[PDB]
Design a binder for these strands. Structure first.
Lengths: 234, 322
RNA sequence: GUGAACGGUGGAGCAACACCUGAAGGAAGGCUUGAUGAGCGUGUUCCCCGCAUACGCGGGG
């Protein structure tokens, strides 16, 4: 259907992962239901759902962005936005002279069609690595392209199934090129790291809509970009 | 007494029609519901029979300025700097009902059911102002007959026909101009701008927080359109008078001498409706120059000794209701 | 075999003449289409959840 995108202007750029941590810190004491919903937590425990995270943090140059997929995610963002804005208001007015937190909100629809010609789409900060078998798949190129093929196609399929619209199942993808290979860490000052791809390019015969997220660690703000801006870049 | 005022608009003209219409991004006036349409207040518009083909006429739409608007304009300019300076120069003051009958034409909504005497009508009729503009509690008839301002256009060829062989507009003559609203609090992103607020950053954050609840008590930050005639095209105006005195015609000509600084249209914050007079035909003879009206001497002299001695007793007995 | 049988309500006659639905009124004020998503940090074995039923597959941070 549609995905709701909310931008917060804190005056200085903070990253998506520290934004998620900062928001989990400030709303920990009061109102546990809304931070549990925005964190996609269990209704009984603190463990996150294994399914698609409906809402997720993202990048913003003057702050952080929030993405709520579907009617449930859009409702969660619409109810949770003013208390978040009041929280950053009190946090940035407690210290210093004080700043004003500005807001933006868009409702970008989702769409997909099929044409018999492949199309270029690039993704930055893409995480591909969770297990040692994927290290064994990425060591050899021939068994690595097919792993990226399956990962991209199944990521499109799972987000299309989560948001509630039908994907054509005759889609074929292809992975052309990579620019850099870098790690992402789970928590700060932790030895554990996950491999990840920087400036991957992919070629899909279908047409790709905006807020289309691929790969792993989607709620931490990786592997999503707007395809509407990439389609006909001006 | 036919006055043919050909004028030329400097800024565009926007005289809004009361019907609320709608518009998408690229044209499509009044779209079907569900296209996310924007509100639109079109310029007001008479249809006119026009020869769109070989001798067949259709009721093509023509955008104009209505006759009631510029009748109020002519009344307001003559009462703004030809009559009320003459009223306050010799010290006479209108009553509140007299002011209401001078500007609107009536004191209250309810008029007199009785008719007034003829000697009253003989006094007020054939007068510089109350002759031209009737009304009051007895609904006195007004001598002056103000038409609407058509553009010189091929759709209005059937109006004021067999004239202007050249200089005739045939193409589309309008444009839709978009005006968006900002929320000024949202567009700040600084501490120096919010240092001015009573309460400051916390008050601005609270108002933005209320705007977050109201985003998904009408708020600000809209984006609308208005449909507006293009500038720089010729327009014609007609003023008519049945059995006029020289003072009434002179008062019309004195209002029309310094008409050039007033507002024929609405939307004057965008300066919409500035016009420069191309010429003034007084029963067909061209009497307009750069320094106002040249010609029509007896009218100017008669209104000159008419506005002197113009007391407010007549306005007071006009506005008195039985 | 009716206190019955037999008997046209008919003819003609123009609802018409003369009256102007009006009068007098301002859609008008106030209101940035060009920013918001596009470029900048992480370096190695770890939570939990299903299918199984452990030979392993899939995935949440």
């Amino acid at each position: 259907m549609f995905v709701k995108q909310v931008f917060f202007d804190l005056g200085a750029r903070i990253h998506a992962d520290e934004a998620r941590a900062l928001v989990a810190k400030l709303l920990d004491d009061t109102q546990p239901g809304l931070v549990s919903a925005l964190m996609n937590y269990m209704p009984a425990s603190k463990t996150s759902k294994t399914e698609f995270p409906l809402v997720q943090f993202s990048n913003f140059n003057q702050g952080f962005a929030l993405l709520g997929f579907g009617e449930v995610g859009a409702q969660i963002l619409s109810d949770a936005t003013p208390i978040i804005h009041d929280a950053m208001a009190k946090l940035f007015a407690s210290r210093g002279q004080g700043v004003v937190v500005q807001v933006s909100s868009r409702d970008v629809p989702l769409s997909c069609e099929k044409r018999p010609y492949g199309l270029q789409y690039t993704v930055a900060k893409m995480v591909v690595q969770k297990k040692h078998e994927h290290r064994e798949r990425l060591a050899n190129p021939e068994t690595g392209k097919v792993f990226l093929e399956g990962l991209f196609l199944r990521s499109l399929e799972r987000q299309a199934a989560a948001v509630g619209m039908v994907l054509p199942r005759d889609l074929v993808v292809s992975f052309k090129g990579a620019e850099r290979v870098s790690s992402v860490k789970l928590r700060p000052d932790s030895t554990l790291a996950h491999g990840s791809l920087r400036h991957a390019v992919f070629e899909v015969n279908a047409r790709l809509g905006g807020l289309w997220s691929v790969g792993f660690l989607l709620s931490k703000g990786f592997g999503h970009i707007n395809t509407d801006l990439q389609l006909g870049q001006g | 007494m036919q006055i043919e005022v050909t004028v030329r608009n400097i800024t565009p003209i926007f005289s809004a029609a009361p019907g609320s219409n709608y518009i998408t991004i690229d044209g499509t006036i009044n779209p079907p519901p569900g296209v996310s349409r924007f509100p639109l207040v079109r310029t007001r518009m008479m249809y006119v029979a026009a020869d769109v083909g070989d001798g067949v006429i259709k009721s093509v739409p023509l955008q104009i300025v209505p006759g009631n608007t510029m009748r109020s304009l002519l009344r307001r300019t003559m009462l703004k700097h030809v009559i009320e300076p003459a009223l306050v120069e010799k010290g006479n003051k209108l009553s509140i009902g007299a002011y209401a009958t001078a500007y609107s034409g009536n004191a209250t909504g309810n008029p007199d059911g009785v008719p007034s005497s003829f000697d009253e009508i003989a006094t007020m009729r054939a007068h510089p102002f109350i002759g031209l503009f009737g009304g009051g509690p007895r609904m006195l008839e007004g001598r002056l007959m103000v038409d609407s301002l058509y553009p010189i256009h091929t759709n209005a060829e059937r109006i004021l026909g067999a004239g202007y062989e050249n200089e005739m507009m045939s193409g589309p003559i309008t444009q839709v101009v978009w005006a968006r609203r900002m929320d000024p609090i949202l567009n700040l992103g600084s501490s120096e701008d919010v240092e001015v607020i009573n309460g400051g950053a916390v008050a601005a954050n609270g108002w933005i927080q209320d705007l977050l609840a109201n985003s998904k008590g009408r708020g600000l930050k809209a984006f609308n359109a208005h449909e507006v005639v293009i500038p720089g095209l010729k327009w014609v105006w007609r003023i008519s008078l049945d059995r006029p005195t020289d003072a009434q015609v002179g008062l019309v000509l004195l209002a029309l001498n310094k008409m050039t600084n007033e507002r024929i249209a609405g939307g004057h914050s965008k300066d919409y409706g500035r016009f420069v007079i191309d010429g003034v035909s007084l029963n067909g003879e061209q009497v307009w120059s750069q320094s106002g009206i040249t010609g029509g001497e007896q009218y100017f002299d008669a209104v000159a000794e008419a506005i002197d001695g113009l007391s407010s007793k007549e306005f007071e007995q006009f506005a008195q209701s039985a």
